[PDB]
Structure formats: structure tokens, C-alpha cells
Write a protein that binds this ligand. Sequence first.
Ligand SMILES: O=C(CC1CCCCC1)Nn1cnnc1
Length: 119
Amino acid sequence: YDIQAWKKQCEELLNLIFQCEDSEPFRQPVDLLEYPDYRDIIDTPMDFATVRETLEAGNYESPMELCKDVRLIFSNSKAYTPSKRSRIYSMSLRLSAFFEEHISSVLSDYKSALRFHKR
Ligand SMILES: O=C(CC1CCCCC1)Nn1cnnc1
């Protein structure tokens, strides 16, 4: 029932994501010089360095907020992909599966801890 435990759990999950080769297209903001129309399609760019920096600045109050930003990385990749002939989108799907598999217990433990706190 540790209400703060999610933060270090998210830091470790981000470390595993950065070592994963599938995170390569998502480690830094999408390069607007490489994709000049990117902002005509994507309203809110998001990437794993931004998520890590937001976490380390103490600007996430809960792991649900961090989740929303990580899922936005995958949603943006899905919206910007032209077709199946895209290594980036395929990497996004495997990385999303890995993320969801690992974040499930972080979310559950946090929500359980907060329910215990408010008992
Ligand atoms: O169509 C899609 C998703 C689709 C893309 C090809 C692989 C399977 C998933 N996204 N999208 C791009 N432009 N408008 C929407």
C-alpha cells in the first residue's frame, strides 16, 4: 500500500523501454525536419524522453497520467503511419504490448494503495 512506489517502478520500466531496440523511433521528439507535415497530423507530440523528464521533474501526480502520455506516443505513431510497410508502426505495436504488460501491476498497486489510504 505504498502510494509513492509507482514512481520508481515507472523509472525502471522506462529504463527497460530505452534498452529495447523497438523504442528507437520514440526516444526523442519526432524530427520535424525529417517529417515536415508532422504537426499538420499530430496535435500533441510525445516521446519517451519527454515522459522521463516529466516524471523526474515531479510533474506526474499518478502513474495514470504517465500512462496517458505513453499511450499518446503509440496513438501518434498509429495516426502518422501511411501503411503496414512501416517499421516504425510495427515497432510501436510491440513496444505498446511490452508497456501494457508491465504497467498493469503498477496501476493496480497504485489504485489499491490509494483505496487503502482513503478507507
Ligand atoms: O490507418 C491507420 C492505422 C493503420 C495504418 C497501417 C497499418 C495498420 C494500422 N492510421 N492512419 C493513418 N492515416 N490516417 C489514419
